[PDB]
C-alpha cells in the first residue's frame, strides 16, 4: 500500500500529490466593498460602443457581498463568485492579497482569474521564512522600468534563475472580464530540464507564503472629467479564482503532509529521516551525509551499527573520506568494555567469549594479566592469552615454566 | 614461473 | 437524480507520460446521491489552464494527444453536471523526449600502424576497404596515461595518414582512427600502440632533502626524488658534495649511484663544515641538468 516501498520492499523516491495549496485557505486583503456600502459599475464592450451597468456592494447581504473568502472558494463557471476591492484605489495606492500556507511548498504555478479587467501593474511575492521578509517572484506591467525597476521583456539568465522577471504579457485590458494571469515558476529557466540535480531552482520554487500586489489599474482616462463619481466607481480589482499549485516540499522522502500535535503542517518523513521538510536525518542514522532523493537513486538515510553496545552514533567526515564515500558513522561511548568505530571488538585488556555472540552483554570477558608475570595488559582476543615474559606457561601469565624458579627481578620473573 | 612459489601490513595516512 | 448540490471531488487520478501524449486514468467520486454528467480534463505546461477537454460520465480513461517533447504538464480532473463543475483533482507529468533513430554505422579503418619517427613525432597510417569523390574525412585520437584522467587529443585528416606532434619522450601512446561521412559515421578502429623515443633529460631532480642521522652523527643521509622531465628509463644518479659552492664541478667530488635506489649513505664527513648538495639524473641519450644547492651545517 505504501508508495515509499518497492515491489520487493526496497526504498524509492516519495513525492506528495499535486495540490492547489490556496484552496479553502483564509486570504488577508487590504480592501473590500460594503463597509460602508458603496456603488460599483460593470463596463461591457460590444462592437465600437461601451456600456455600463451599476450595482451595489453590501457586505451584510450574502448575495451582494464580495468577501476575501470568494477567492479561495470552489470555482464554478455556472455560478462565479469573486472578491471586490474598494472603488478607485489607483496608483500610488495599492491592493494586496497575502496567503499563508504555513509550510515549505515547491510551487509550480500561481494563477488569478479576474472578474474586472486585469491590472496594468501586478506583482507576485514569496516568503522563505513564515512572513518576515519578502522576495519578488514575478512582475507584470506595461512599463517594467518606471513601475517595478526591472527590464521589460528580459530573457531568463543562466547566471541568476533565482531572480524575478518582468513582462508586458497577460497585462492587456481585453478581456474586460474573465482575464487570466498564470505564473509558471520554472518557465524559461535554462536549467529547469535538470531540476532534480539543480538546487538553485529547487530553492526558487520554495515558498511558505504568497503575496500578490495590484499596483496600477487600467483606465480609459474619463476619471478626470466633469463627473468624477460615475467614472471612478467603474474602476476596481476583482478576482474569482486564486490557485497556488505545487507539491509539499519533502525532499523526496514523504508521500503526504500531516498536521502534528501542535496543529502544524509537516511531512510524514520516510527512508529513516526527520524534519519539517525531511531536510535532516533521524537519530542513530548518521552513517551517510544527508542527500535529497532523485528519480534513479532513493538516497535513503543509512542506519548506524554499534552491535547493541551504544545508543548514540556520530558522523565523521574524515572516516567517510577514508572509506571512499561509503560509510562514516562512528559509535559514541561504547558500553560492555568494547572499542572501535562500529563497536565490533573488545577494548585493550579484554577478550571475546566465543560461547556467546557479539550482540550479547557478556561478549567481552576480563583479561586478568598478572602485573609481574605478563609483559603487557592487552591480550589475544580469540583465545585469551596474556603476553608472557620468560616463556611463562600460565593462561594469565601466573605460573613459571618447567625447570624455571620464581625470581626477585621485575625484568626476569622466572629463572632456569 | 614468475609467482611467489604470513602477510605483514604497512599503513600511512594524514592528520 | 440529484442536482441540488455541486458534484463531489473524484476518488483517483493517474497519468502516464509518453513522447507526445499523456495517458490519463480516473475513478468517479464515492458519493452517488449527486448525479454526474461527465469529466473535464484540464491540461497545459506549468498551469492546467491552457486547454480543456470535456467527456461523458461513462469514460474512465483518456490519452491527451499533440504535446511538446520534454515539457512539464499539469493535468486537472473535474466532475461536472447541470448545476456546475466540482472540486478538482490535480497531477503533473514530464513528457518523454523525442528520440531520433540512429543511422547504420560505416566500416572502421583497417591496417592501423604506428611508425615512431622522433621523441615528439609518430606518423599514423590507415587503410579503407570501402574505397574502390566523397566528402568523408578521417579523425585521429591519442592519449597517454600520465597525467591521470586526461582526455584523447583529436585531429582531422583528409588523407590516409597523419603526423602526430607535441608528444613527451619515452611514453606509451594509444592511437585509433574513425571515418565521418555525415549523419552516418563509423566507430574507432583497432587500437595501435606507439611508444616515443628516449631523450636527454631537460629537468633536474626535485625535493632535495638532507638530514642528520640519529645514531652515528658523522654519517648524514641525502634524499632525492626523480625529476618530472625524466625523458626515459633512469639508469643512475650522480650526487655532488663540497664545502664551497663558487668552485666548479671539477673541484666537487663525484659520488654516482644506481637508478633503482633513491637513497645513499655518506660516511666520513668533516666536523664544523657547511655542506652543499647537487643531484643529477642519468639516461641512455645523455645527462640531466644541474640543480640548486642546499644549506646544511655539521656541529
Ligand atoms: O433593473 S432591475 O429590475 O434588474 O433592478 C435591480 C434588481 O434586479 C435584481 C432582480 O432581478 S429582476 O427581478 O429581474 O429585477 O437583479 C439581480 O438578479 C437578476 C436575476 O433575477 S432574479 O430575480 O434575482 O432571479 C440578475 O440578472 S441576470 O444576470 O441573471 O440576467 C441581475 O444581474 S444584472 O443586474 O443583470 O447584472 C442581478 O442584479 S444585481 O447584480 O444584483 O445588481 C435584483 O438583485 S438581486 O437582489 O441580487 O436578485 C435587484 O434588486 S435589488 O433590490 O437592488 O437587490
Ligand atoms: O521607451 S521607454 O521610455 O520605456 O524607455 C526605453 C528604454 O529601454 C531601453 C533598454 O531598457 S533597459 O535595457 O531595460 O534599461 O531600450 C533599449 O534596450 C531595449 C532592449 O534591448 S534589446 O535590443 O531588445 O536586447 C530595446 O528594446 S527591444 O528592441 O529589444 O525591444 C531598445 O530598442 S527599441 O527602442 O525597442 O527598438 C533599446 O533602445 S536603443 O536601440 O538602445 O536605443 C533603453 O534604451 S537605451 O538606454 O538606449 O539602451 C531605454 O532607457 S532610457 O533610459 O530611456 O534610455
Ligand atoms: O573535482 S572532483 O571530481 O574530484 O570532485 C570534487 C568536488 O566535490 C566537492 C563538492 O561536491 S559534492 O560532494 O557533490 O557536494 O567536494 C566534496 O566532495 C569530494 C568528493 O569527491 S570524489 O571524487 O568523489 O572523491 C571530496 O573529496 S575527497 O575527499 O573524497 O577526495 C571533498 O573533500 S575536500 O574539500 O577535498 O576535502 C568534498 O568537500 S567538502 O566535504 O564538501 O568540503 C567540491 O568541493 S567544494 O566546492 O569545496 O564543495 C569539489 O569541486 S572542485 O571543483 O574539485 O573544487
Ligand atoms: O507499456 S509496456 O507494455 O511497454 O510496459 C512498460 C511498463 O514498464 C514501465 C515501468 O517499469 S518498472 O518501474 O521497471 O517496473 O517502464 C519504465 O521502466 C523503467 C523503470 O525502471 S525502474 O526500476 O522503476 O527505475 C524506465 O526505463 S529505464 O530508464 O530504466 O530504461 C522507464 O521509467 S522512467 O523514464 O525512469 O520513469 C520506463 O520505461 S519506458 O522507458 O520505455 O518503458 C512503465 O512505464 S512508465 O509508466 O512510464 O513508468 C510501464 O508500465 S505500464 O503499466 O505498462 O504502464
Ligand atoms: C444593505 O445596506 C444597508 C445600508 O444602510 C443596510 O442597512 C442593510 O442592512 C444591508 N442589507 C442587508 C440585507 O443587510
Ligand atoms: C452563487 O453565487 C453567489 C454570488 O453572490 C453566491 O452568493 C452564492 O453563494 C454562490 N453559490 C454557490 C453554491 O457557490
Ligand atoms: C503597496 O503599498 C504599501 C503601503 O500601503 C507599501 O508598503 C508597498 O511597498 C506598496 N507596494 C507593493 C508592491 O506592495
Ligand atoms: C573535425 O571537423 C569537424 C567538422 O568540421 C569539427 O566538428 C571537429 O571539431 C574537427 N576537429 C578537429 C580537431 O579539427
Ligand atoms: Ca470563486
Amino acid at each position: 500500500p505504501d508508495p515509499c516501498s518497492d515491489e520487493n520492499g526496497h526504498p524509492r523516491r516519495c513525492i506528495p500529490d499535486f495540490v492547489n495549496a490556496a484552496f479553502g485557505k483564509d486570504v488577508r486583503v487590504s480592501s473590500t466593498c460594503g463597509r460602508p456600502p458603496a456603488r460599483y459599475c460593470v463596463v461591457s464592450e460590444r462592437g465600437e460602443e461601451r456600456l455600463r451597468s451599476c450595482h451595489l456592494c453590501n457586505a451584510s447581504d450574502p448575495k451582494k457581498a464580495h468577501p476575501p473568502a470568494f477567492l479561495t472558494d470552489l470555482n464554478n463557471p455556472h455560478n462565479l463568485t469573486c472578491w471586490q476591492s474598494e472603488n478607485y484605489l489607483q496608483f500610488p495606492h495599492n491592493v494586496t492579497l497575502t496567503l499563508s500556507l504555513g509550510k515549505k511548498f515547491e510551487v509550480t504555478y500561481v494563477s488569478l482569474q479576474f472578474c474586472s479587467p486585469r491590472p496594468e501593474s501586478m506583482a507576485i511575492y514569496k516568503s522563505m521564512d513564515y512572513g518576515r521578509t519578502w522576495v519578488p517572484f514575478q512582475f507584470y506591467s506595461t512599463q517594467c522600468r518606471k513601475m517595478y525597476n526591472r527590464p521589460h521583456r528580459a530573457p531568463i539568465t543562466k547566471q541568476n534563475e533565482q531572480e524575478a522577471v518582468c513582462t508586458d504579457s497577460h497585462t492587456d485590458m481585453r478581456p474586460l472580464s474573465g482575464g487570466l494571469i498564470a505564473f509558471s515558476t520554472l518557465d524559461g529557466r535554462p536549467s529547469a530540464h535538470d531540476f532534480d540535480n539543480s538546487p538553485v531552482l529547487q530553492d526558487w520554487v520554495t515558498a511558505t507564503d504568497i503575496r500578490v500586489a495590484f499596483s496600477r489599474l487600467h483606465t480609459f482616462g474619463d476619471e478626470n472629467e466633469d463627473d468624477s463619481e460615475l467614472a471612478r466607481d467603474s474602476y476596481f480589482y476583482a478576482v474569482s479564482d486564486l490557485q497556488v499549485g505545487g507539491r509539499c516540499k519533502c525532499n523526496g522522502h514523504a508521500a503526504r503532509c500531516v498536521r502534528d500535535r501542535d496543529d502544524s503542517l509537516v511531512c510524514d518523513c520516510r527512508h529513516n529521516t526527520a524534519g519539517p521538510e525531511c531536510d535532516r536525518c533521524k537519530p542513530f542514522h548518521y552513517d551517510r551525509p544527508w542527500q535529497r532523493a532523485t528519480a534513479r537513486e532513493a538516497n535513503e538515510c543509512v542506519a548506524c551499527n554499534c552491535n547493541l553496545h551504544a545508543r548514540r552514533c556520530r558522523f565523521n567526515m574524515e572516516l567517510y573520506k577514508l572509506s571512499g564515500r561509503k560509510s562514516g558513522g562512528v559509535c559514541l561511548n561504547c558500553r560492555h568494555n568494547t572499542a572501535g568505530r562500529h563497536c565490533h571488538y573488545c577494548k585493550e585488556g579484554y577478550y571475546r567469549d566465543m560461547g556467546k555472540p557479539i550482540t550479547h552483554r557478556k561478549a567481552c570477558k576480563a583479561c586478568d594479566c598478572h602485573p609481574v608475570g605478563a609483559a603487557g595488559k592487552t591480550c589475544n582476543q580469540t583465545t585469551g592469552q596474556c603476553p608472557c615474559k620468560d616463556g611463562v606457561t600460565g593462561i594469565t601469565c601466573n605460573r613459571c615454566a618447567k625447570g624455571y624458579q620464581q625470581s626477585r627481578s621485575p625484568i626476569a620473573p622466572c629463572i632456569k | 614461473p614468475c609467482n611467489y612459489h604470513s602477510y605483514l601490513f604497512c599503513g600511512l595516512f594524514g592528520d | 437524480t440529484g442536482e441540488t448540490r455541486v458534484p463531489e471531488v473524484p476518488s483517483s487520478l493517474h497519468v502516464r507520460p509518453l513522447v507526445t501524449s499523456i495517458v490519463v486514468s480516473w475513478t468517479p467520486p464515492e458519493n452517488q446521491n449527486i448525479v454526474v454528467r461527465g469529466y473535464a480534463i484540464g491540461y497545459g505546461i506549468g498551469s492546467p489552464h491552457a486547454q480543456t477537454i470535456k467527456v461523458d460520465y461513462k469514460q474512465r480513461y483518456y490519452t491527451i494527444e499533440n504535446l511538446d517533447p520534454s515539457s512539464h504538464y499539469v493535468i486537472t480532473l473535474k466532475a461536472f453536471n447541470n448545476v456546475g463543475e466540482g472540486i478538482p483533482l490535480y497531477e503533473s507529468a514530464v513528457t518523454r523526449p523525442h528520440t531520433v533513430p540512429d543511422p547504420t554505422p560505416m566500416m572502421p579503418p583497417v591496417g592501423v600502424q604506428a611508425s615512431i619517427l622522433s621523441h615528439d613525432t609518430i606518423r599514423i597510417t590507415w587503410a579503407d576497404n570501402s574505397l574502390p569523390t566523397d566528402s568523408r574525412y578521417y579523425t585521429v585520437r591519442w592519449k597517454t596515461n600520465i597525467p591521470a584522467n586526461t582526455k584523447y587529443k583529436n585531429a582531422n585528416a583528409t588523407t590516409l595518414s597523419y603526423l602526430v606532434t607535441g608528444l613527451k619522450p619515452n611514453t606509451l601512446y594509444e592511437f585509433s582512427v574513425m571515418v565521418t561521412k555525415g549523419r552516418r559515421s563509423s566507430t574507432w578502429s583497432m587500437t595501435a600502440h606507439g611508444a616515443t623515443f628516449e631523450l636527454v633529460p631537460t629537468s633536474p631532480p626535485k625535493d632535495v632533502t638532507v638530514v642528520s642521522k640519529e645514531g652515528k652523527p658523522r654519517t648524514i643521509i641525502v634524499n632525492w626524488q626523480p625529476p618530472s622531465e625524466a625523458n626515459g628509463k633512469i639508469t643512475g644518479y650522480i650526487i655532488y658534495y663540497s664545502t664551497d659552492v663558487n668552485a666548479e664541478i671539477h673541484d666537487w667530488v663525484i659520488e654516482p649511484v644506481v637508478g633503482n635506489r633513491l637513497t645513499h649513505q655518506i660516511q666520513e664527513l668533516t666536523l664544523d663544515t657547511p655542506y652543499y648538495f647537487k643531484i643529477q639524473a642519468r639516461n641512455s641519450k645523455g645527462m640531466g641538468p644541474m640543480s640548486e644547492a642546499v644549506q646544511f651545517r655539521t656541529p
Side-chain angles (χ1 to χ4, degrees):
Chain A
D2 176 56
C4 291
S5 187
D6 202 64
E7 283 76 76
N8 187 43
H10 276 278
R12 62 184 284 178
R13 185 182 64 172
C14 314
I15 296 161
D17 297 300
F18 201 102
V19 172
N20 167 27
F23 198 79
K25 288 194 185 173
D26 187 270
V27 182
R28 286 272 162 263
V29 311
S30 60
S31 62
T32 299
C33 56
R35 294 171 201 269
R39 53 167 286 178
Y40 71 99
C41 307
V42 175
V43 67
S44 56
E45 210 173 40
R46 193 178 284 179
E48 285 165 24
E49 61 264 348
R50 294 192 283 104
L51 298 149
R52 285 173 177 179
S53 58
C54 302
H55 319 283
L56 192 83
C57 189
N58 212 344
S60 300
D61 187 82
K63 289 282 278 176
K64 283 189 264 287
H66 299 281
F70 276 27
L71 300 160
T72 195
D73 70 343
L74 174 62
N75 189 39
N76 200 57
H78 287 238
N79 192 62
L80 287 148
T81 47
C82 27
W83 150 85
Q84 203 191 295
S85 65
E86 280 179 77
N87 302 319
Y88 200 74
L89 281 171
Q90 184 70 294
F91 168 84
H93 310 107
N94 69 47
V95 181
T96 63
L97 341 160
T98 47
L99 170 79
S100 286
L101 319 164
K103 208 220 169 279
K104 286 184 183 172
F105 255 86
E106 283 190 13
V107 182
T108 309
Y109 81 94
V110 177
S111 83
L112 294 126
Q113 197 183 79
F114 294 85
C115 276
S116 63
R118 293 180 297 188
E120 190 270 358
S121 286
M122 196 196 81
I124 303 158
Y125 290 92
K126 73 168 191 182
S127 196
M128 295 295 216
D129 36 62
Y130 302 86
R132 283 167 178 88
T133 193
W134 297 89
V135 179
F137 225 168
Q138 187 71 28
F139 299 103
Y140 293 98
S141 183
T142 318
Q143 309 162 303
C144 287
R145 178 183 204 256
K146 294 176 192 76
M147 198 78 176
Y148 291 112
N149 188 76
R150 291 289 191 278
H152 164 261
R153 280 195 190 272
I156 324 296
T157 182
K158 176 77 191 75
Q159 327 304 322
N160 201 18
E161 292 160 278
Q162 276 206 273
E163 198 148 37
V165 158
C166 190
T167 49
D168 67 299
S169 293
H170 306 62
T171 66
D172 283 2
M173 215 188 298
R174 287 99 167 90
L176 295 154
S177 186
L180 184 99
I181 295 166
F183 157 58
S184 178
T185 60
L186 285 163
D187 210 299
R189 319 275 166 192
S191 55
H193 66 284
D194 193 36
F195 178 78
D196 278 16
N197 296 326
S198 154
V200 60
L201 284 163
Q202 272 160 20
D203 193 63
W204 173 243
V205 295
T206 312
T208 60
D209 319 273
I210 302 287
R211 175 192 284 180
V212 168
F214 306 116
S215 301
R216 204 196 282 157
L217 40 86
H218 270 296
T219 195
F220 294 100
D222 297 346
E223 64 281 358
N224 300 330
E225 288 185 355
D226 188 34
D227 197 292
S228 56
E229 206 196 300
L230 277 146
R232 286 180 178 187
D233 281 329
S234 62
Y235 302 106
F236 44 80
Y237 301 112
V239 181
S240 70
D241 209 37
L242 169 59
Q243 296 183 354
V244 177
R247 298 163 185 270
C248 222
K249 190 179 194 179
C250 303
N251 286 286
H253 305 308
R256 52 186 171 97
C257 280
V258 193
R259 289 264 182 176
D260 63 2
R261 57 179 182 185
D262 303 276
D263 204 79
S264 312
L265 198 83
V266 179
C267 294
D268 182 51
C269 295
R270 300 296 288 261
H271 312 138
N272 310 322
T273 67
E277 287 84 46
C278 306
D279 56 276
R280 52 180 182 88
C281 266
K282 221 193 174 184
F284 201 71
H285 300 93
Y286 315 104
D287 209 38
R288 218 162 70 189
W290 185 86
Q291 210 174 25
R292 182 195 162 103
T294 183
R296 202 78 72 175
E297 292 291 283
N299 288 358
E300 72 287 320
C301 211
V302 184
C304 274
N305 188 16
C306 302
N307 300 286
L308 302 149
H309 300 299
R311 283 198 173 191
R312 298 198 284 104
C313 82
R314 202 80 192 90
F315 181 80
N316 194 281
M317 189 62 85
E318 295 92 330
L319 276 168
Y320 184 74
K321 279 172 182 178
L322 280 156
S323 65
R325 289 180 80 184
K326 186 77 183 176
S327 176
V330 53
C331 302
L332 301 178
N333 298 328
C334 269
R335 296 192 307 271
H336 315 91
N337 303 299
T338 60
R341 53 174 284 175
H342 278 80
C343 218
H344 51 291
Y345 64 91
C346 308
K347 69 178 192 185
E348 279 185 79
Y350 282 85
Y351 76 102
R352 206 190 164 271
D353 173 54
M354 292 299 148
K356 289 168 176 184
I358 192 71
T359 51
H360 202 80
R361 305 167 292 181
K362 290 185 180 285
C364 302
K365 209 260 178 179
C367 216
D368 310 298
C369 304
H370 213 274
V372 300
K377 295 168 181 74
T378 181
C379 64
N380 193 280
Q381 278 70 27
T382 185
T383 59
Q385 186 71 64
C386 294
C388 296
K389 207 178 270 181
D390 297 26
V392 158
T393 186
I395 305 96
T396 49
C397 307
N398 61 302
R399 55 180 200 270
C400 283
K402 192 198 180 181
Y404 281 84
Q405 288 89 20
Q406 272 194 59
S407 172
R408 291 163 190 261
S409 187
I411 304 148
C414 309
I415 289 170
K416 200 168 88 185
Chain B
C2 270
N3 215 316
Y4 188 80
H5 62 88
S6 58
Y7 290 92
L8 291 155
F9 320 99
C10 209
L12 183 77
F13 58 91
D15 188 78
Chain C
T1 307
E3 275 171 43
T4 184
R5 287 192 287 176
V6 182
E8 304 281 81
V9 56
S11 43
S12 83
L13 170 73
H14 181 79
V15 302
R16 187 198 155 194
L18 279 134
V19 58
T20 48
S21 49
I22 298 163
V23 184
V24 184
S25 299
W26 63 90
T27 53
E30 277 178 71
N31 193 277
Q32 272 80 78
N33 295 281
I34 311 302
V35 68
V36 65
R37 293 276 178 177
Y39 305 91
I41 339 289
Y43 69 101
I45 313 158
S47 79
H49 306 75
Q51 272 153 314
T52 309
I53 295 160
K54 284 192 179 190
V55 292
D56 57 85
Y57 66 97
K58 298 176 182 79
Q59 293 279 275
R60 298 275 172 271
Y61 72 102
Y62 182 70
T63 71
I64 300 167
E65 294 282 337
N66 289 304
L67 306 169
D68 290 286
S70 305
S71 297
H72 168 236
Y73 289 87
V74 172
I75 297 109
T76 283
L77 207 123
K78 278 175 162 281
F80 74 97
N81 64 6
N82 296 98
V83 82
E85 289 177 357
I87 308 103
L89 212 64
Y90 306 78
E91 195 70 64
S92 70
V94 181
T95 50
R96 286 190 167 92
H98 186 81
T99 44
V100 65
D102 296 345
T104 56
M106 302 160 76
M107 189 69 74
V110 289
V112 186
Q113 289 180 289
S115 309
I116 313 111
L117 303 154
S118 62
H119 58 282
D120 66 317
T121 311
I122 311 165
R123 64 175 286 181
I124 311 305
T125 315
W126 63 94
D128 184 59
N129 295 334
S130 314
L131 190 84
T133 47
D134 295 65
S135 43
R136 62 177 180 193
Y137 71 103
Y138 300 95
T139 314
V140 198
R141 69 155 155 107
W142 64 94
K143 189 203 86 73
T144 178
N145 297 6
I146 284 187
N149 298 279
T150 53
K151 277 84 197 172
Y152 297 96
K153 281 179 93 76
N154 293 89
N156 289 335
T158 52
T159 184
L160 287 162
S161 67
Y162 188 80
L163 197 90
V164 182
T165 189
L167 306 161
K168 296 169 182 177
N170 184 253
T171 184
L172 194 70
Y173 278 96
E174 62 173 280
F175 299 96
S176 51
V177 281
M178 74 174 278
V179 62
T180 318
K181 210 155 100 172
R183 298 189 184 271
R184 195 191 174 191
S185 75
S186 192
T187 181
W188 296 104
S189 68
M190 284 190 84
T191 303
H193 298 102
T196 47
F197 287 133
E198 291 181 70
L199 206 79
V200 184
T202 48
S203 74
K206 295 163 188 181
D207 302 301
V208 175
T209 48
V210 181
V211 73
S212 58
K213 190 197 175 180
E214 207 174 338
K216 292 175 187 176
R218 290 279 291 267
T219 57
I220 290 119
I221 182 83
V222 64
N223 258 263
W224 70 96
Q225 285 276 51
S228 51
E229 293 153 30
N231 308 349
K233 194 177 93 173
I234 312 141
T235 41
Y237 283 98
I238 316 140
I239 312 144
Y240 300 90
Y241 64 99
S242 187
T243 50
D244 301 314
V245 267
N246 297 38
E248 285 178 63
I249 313 138
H250 66 264
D251 295 280
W252 286 65
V253 289
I254 324 298
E255 202 180 58
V257 289
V258 76
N260 53 70
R261 281 195 70 255
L262 253 59
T263 41
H264 181 69
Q265 292 198 299
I266 318 140
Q267 301 190 316
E268 297 172 312
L269 297 155
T270 55
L271 290 150
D272 197 41
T273 49
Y275 281 94
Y276 297 99
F277 290 88
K278 195 201 100 173
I279 301 135
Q280 289 192 127
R282 298 213 288 266
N283 259 11
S284 299
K285 303 280 162 186
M287 279 163 73
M290 59 180 280
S291 60
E292 209 169 287
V294 286
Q295 289 188 280
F296 193 84
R297 208 187 174 94
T298 58

